[PDB]
Amino acid sequence: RKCLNTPLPLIYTTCPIGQDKCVKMTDVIRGCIDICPKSSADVEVLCCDTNKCN
């Protein structure tokens, strides 16, 4: 529902209905998501399913 949104520690948005998950990708990018994208050689995906968990 709510997810961290920026490389900064507290900022968030409420997600589009249907985007029930939060992701931190590591530069650092965070935001709302529907399905947890596969991790890769040079990009790491953390995915969690509770408010501001990323």
Curated annotation (Swiss-Prot):
It is found in: Secreted. The keyword Disulfide bond applies. The keyword Secreted applies. Expressed by the venom gland. Disulfide bonds join 3-22, 15-32, 36-47, 48-53. Coiled coil: none annotated. GO terms for cellular component: extracellular region. GO terms for molecular function: toxin activity. It comes from the Eukaryota. Keywords: Cardiotoxin, Disulfide bond, G-protein coupled receptor impairing toxin, Secreted, Signal, Toxin. Negative results: does not affect blood coagulation and does not show significant hemolytic activity. Belongs to the three-finger toxin family. Short-chain subfamily. Aminergic toxin sub-subfamily. Acts as a beta-blocker by binding to beta-1 and beta-2 adrenergic receptors (ADRB1 and ADRB2). It dose-dependently decreases the heart rate (bradycardia), whereas conventional cardiotoxins increases it. At 100 mg/kg, intraperitoneal injection into mice provokes labored breathing, impaired locomotion, lack of response to external stimuli, and death (after 30 minutes). This is Beta-cardiotoxin CTX27. It comes from Ophiophagus hannah. The chain holds residues 22 to 83 of 84 of the full protein.
